[PDB]
Amino acid sequence: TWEVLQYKDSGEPGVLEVFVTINGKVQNITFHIPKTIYMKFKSQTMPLQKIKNCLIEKSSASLPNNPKTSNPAGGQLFKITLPESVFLEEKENCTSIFNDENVLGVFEGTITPHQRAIMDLGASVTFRSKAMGALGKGIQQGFEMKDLSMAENERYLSGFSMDIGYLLHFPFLLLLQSPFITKLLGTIRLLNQMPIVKLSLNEVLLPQLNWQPTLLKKLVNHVLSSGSWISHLIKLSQYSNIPICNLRLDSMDYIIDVLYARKLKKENIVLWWNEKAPLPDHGGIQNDFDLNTSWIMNDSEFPKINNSGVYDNVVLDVGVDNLTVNTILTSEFVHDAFSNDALNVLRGMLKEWWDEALKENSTADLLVNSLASWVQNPNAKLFDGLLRYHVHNLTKKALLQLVNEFSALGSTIVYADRNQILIKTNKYSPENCYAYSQYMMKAVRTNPMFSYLDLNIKRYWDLLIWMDKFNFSGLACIEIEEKENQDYTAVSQWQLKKFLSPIYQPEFEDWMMIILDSMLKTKQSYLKLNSVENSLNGFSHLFSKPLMKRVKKLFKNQQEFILDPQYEADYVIPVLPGSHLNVKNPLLELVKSLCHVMLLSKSTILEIRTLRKELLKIFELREFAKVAEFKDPSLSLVVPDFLCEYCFFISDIDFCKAAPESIFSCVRCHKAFNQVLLQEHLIQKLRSDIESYLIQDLRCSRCHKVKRDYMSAHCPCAGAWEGTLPRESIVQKLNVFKQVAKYYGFDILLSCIADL
Numbered sequence: 001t002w003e004v005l006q007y008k009d010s011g012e013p014g015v016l017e018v019f020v021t022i023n024g025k026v027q028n029i030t031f032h033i034p035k036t037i038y039m040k041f042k043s044q045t046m047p048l049q050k051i052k053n054c055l056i057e058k059s060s061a062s063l064p065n066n067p068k069t070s071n072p073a074g075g076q077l078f079k080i081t082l083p084e085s086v087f088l089e090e091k092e093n094c095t096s097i098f099n100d101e102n103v104l105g106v107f108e109g110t111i112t113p114h115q116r117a118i119m120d121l122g123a124s125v126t127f128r129s130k131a132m133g134a135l136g137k138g139i140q141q142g143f144e145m146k147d148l149s150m151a152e153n154e155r156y157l158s159g160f161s162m163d164i165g166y167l168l169h170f171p172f173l174l175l176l177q178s179p180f181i182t183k184l185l186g187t188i189r190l191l192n193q194m195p196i197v198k199l200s201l202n203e204v205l206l207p208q209l210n211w212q213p214t215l216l217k218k219l220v221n222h223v224l225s226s227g228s229w230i231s232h233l234i235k236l237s238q239y240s241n242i243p244i245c246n247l248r249l250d251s252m253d254y255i256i257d258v259l260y261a262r263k264l265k266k267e268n269i270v271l272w273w274n275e276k277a278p279l280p281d282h283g284g285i286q287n288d289f290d291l292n293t294s295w296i297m298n299d300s301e302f303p304k305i306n307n308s309g310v311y312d313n314v315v316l317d318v319g320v321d322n323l324t325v326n327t328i329l330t331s332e333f334v335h336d337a338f339s340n341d342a343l344n345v346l347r348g349m350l351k352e353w354w355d356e357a358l359k360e361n362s363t364a365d366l367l368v369n370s371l372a373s374w375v376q377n378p379n380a381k382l383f384d385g386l387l388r389y390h391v392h393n394l395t396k397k398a399l400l401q402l403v404n405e406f407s408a409l410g411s412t413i414v415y416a417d418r419n420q421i422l423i424k425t426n427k428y429s430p431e432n433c434y435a436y437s438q439y440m441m442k443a444v445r446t447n448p449m450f451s452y453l454d455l456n457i458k459r460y461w462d463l464l465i466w467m468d469k470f471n472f473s474g475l476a477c478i479e480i481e482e483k484e485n486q487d488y489t490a491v492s493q494w495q496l497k498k499f500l501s502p503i504y505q506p507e508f509e510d511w512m513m514i515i516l517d518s519m520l521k522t523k524q525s526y527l528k529l530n531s532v533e534n535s536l537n538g539f540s541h542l543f544s545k546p547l548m549k550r551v552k553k554l555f556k557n558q559q560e561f562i563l564d565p566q567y568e569a570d571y572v573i574p575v576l577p578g579s580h581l582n583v584k585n586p587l588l589e590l591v592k593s594l595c596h597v598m599l600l601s602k603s604t605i606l607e608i609r610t611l612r613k614e615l616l617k618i619f620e621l622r623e624f625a626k627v628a629e630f631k632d633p634s635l636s637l638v639v640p641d642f643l644c645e646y647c648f649f650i651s652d653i654d655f656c657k658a659a660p661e662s663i664f665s666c667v668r669c670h671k672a673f674n675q676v677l678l679q680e681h682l683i684q685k686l687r688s689d690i691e692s693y694l695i696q697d698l699r700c701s702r703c704h705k706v707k708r709d710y711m712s713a714h715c716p717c718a719g720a721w722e723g724t725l726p727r728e729s730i731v732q733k734l735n736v737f738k739q740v741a742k743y744y745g746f747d748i749l750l751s752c753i754a755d756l
């Protein structure tokens with residue numbers, strides 16, 4: 001039994017220098033690893049060359065499923081194993097089996113000897129040599145490992161007793177903490193020969209004034225955290241079976257990659273493993289443009305429900321956590337699907353991880369939490385776009401099924417965002433829904449479809465006005481109590497106010513505070529007294545007469561002071577990111593936006609529309625004038641699926657509607673983001689949009705149909721060829737990016753706009 005500390009390769013192929021630990025102390029040994037390659041070539045027969053001293057054998061391994069490669073043809077996959085030195089030798093000559101005619105692909109040329117040994121042997125490698133006593137012969141030369149190998153149990157890797165050191169930069173098992181590992185390793189060649197545990201905290205920043213205290217504070221924690229670092233490293237390593245020095249702490253996708261790869265190798269499935277490459281290794285077919293792949297990697301938008309209105313019943317605000325893991329755990333013709341066998345392997349892995357995590361296991365809990373992050377990361381190895389598409393498509397179905405399940409009992413969906421769900425209840429008072437909420441939660445959890453979902457009620461709503469997530473108001477209570485009248489807080493988040501003149505913004509809020517009070521009073525009166533929700537009929541009668549007089553007075557003052565240069569500070573229309581409307585009369589916008597909020601009732605249409613006409617009579621405008629219609633003042637630019645590294649939260653960020661302090665900070669935890677990452681994601685969105693416009697399909701203006709010719713003038717129908725994506729849409733999309741890049745300081749995106 002050997003405790004390998006740091007597997008390390010060198011210039012010579014199939015050579016692994018190992019800083020192993022023998023019962024005495026640390027020592028250096030070397031391993032020899034042959035190269036195993038997967039050949040798909042020809043349709044039948046075999047080369048019969050015999051020139052190479054290798055081992056070939058016809059195999060039946062389960063290949064991946066690239067959408068382009070769909071033809072079955074025949075099966076003659078091979079399992080050629082051949083040492084890497086003579087493989088480099090064979091690279092030289094022109095004639096050889098690996099480079100000849102009728103070669104479909106090489107499937108595992110990317111995996112290095114280091115990875116092969118760390119996946120096959122592991123941390124606890126032992127010697128089962130026996131035969132002749134070549135232990136001395138094995139130690140003087142390089143011990144060839146292919147013939148003799150065994151992996152002993154690693155339940156207890158080490159009882160630690162050893163010296164630890166530091167080496168840090170702020171631009172013996174030493175710990176390397178530097179922004180540039182490669183530069184420091186190359187500059188001091190002697191640093192290579194010593195074993196190092198490489199933990200990298202990067203991007204040191206300074207306030208540029210009085211930086212000595214902050215340098216001292218940044219040094220103190222790194223000095224004092226040594227006991228924690230080694231302890232956590234050993235805690236991960238004892239379960240991981242990866243050697244301590246190869247493993248890193250922040251690296252979490254590597255554990256998933258090794259475990260999934262070795263449990264796949266337990267089966268006959270091919271790895272498709274690819275190293276420092278964002279795309280899978282499919283044998284070389286992955287280096288060509290394909291329409292299906294381009295569509296499946298450009299579909300990251302999630303559906304949503306935004307049923308708007310004013311609700312006089314109670315509304316529940318539940319938060320659905322563990323959606324993706326629940327989706328995975330629960331569950332020829334198709335050319336765009338992931339292999340079912342690997343899917344079942346992943347399902348079994350997640351099930352066993354969850355079961356061990358239930359029994360007080362920290363590492364299993366970490367793996368379960370980090371699986372969702374691993375799925376969407378291309379930089380993680382074994383990453384497949386088909387897997388991401390499969391997971392997203394099943395999650396999309398799961399959310400609709402959950403909404404339908406909620407629809408089984410008397411309730412109505414209002415909103416759905418993968419993290420928040422709003423439910424309309426039949427009951428009228430929040431104090432009478434304690435039992436029904438619990439019953440619904442138990443019923444939802446009882447279903448086998450949603451056994452692993454986490455649901456928690458965040459707020460109870462008494463009166464809610466809903467337009468979208470960025471524009472709402474009402475009265476809410478955090479949690480209902482006993483024998484005490486429930487405390488209610490009034491919330492009002494209106495982005496619509498930001499596009500108003502400074503003199504009218506206070507008026508907007510003041511009049512909304514009267515609308516809400518009147519609606520609450522009339523609802524209480526209707527409840528006390530006993531097609532239309534009669535709780536809210538007649539609320540406008542209380543505040544109509546004051547509103548008319550106030551509007552008249554405001555109009556008179558505007559007529560008096562609009563041309564006064566002294567009052568030029570007022571009556572200035574702000575410029576905001578996503579603003580497109582060019583509008584003239586400031587008080588008209590206030591009255592329109594105030595009436596639009598009342599209009600979302602669906603039960604008091606006539607009453608509100610009479611008041612709207614009467615108010616519009618103060619101005620010289622008619623009830624159906626085009627200038628008197630409400631449009632949303634703001635555009636939208638939504639970047640989907642941004643990761644919080646310290647929170648493990650999936651959030652969709654919209655750069656136009658969302659107010660600041662939210663663009664650059666996570667929601668669950670108030671941790672700031674990194675700006676250049678946001679700029680790079682915006683650039684990715686822009687270039688992807690341009691590509692999607694450039695690869696669109698054509699259609700007939702009358703026969704809505706797809707063009708099936710490469711050279712034609714028009715439809716067999718007398719018509720014309722038009723585009724599925726019109727130019728005006730992409731022009732507007734390029735327009736909004738320019739404003740977003742100028743309101744906030746994004747130099748990289750501004751440069752990208754000007755290089756077009």
Ligand SMILES: [Zn+2]
Nearest residue numbers: 644647666669
């Ligand atoms: Zn967070």
Ligand SMILES: [Zn+2]
Nearest residue numbers: 700703715717
């Ligand atoms: Zn036609």
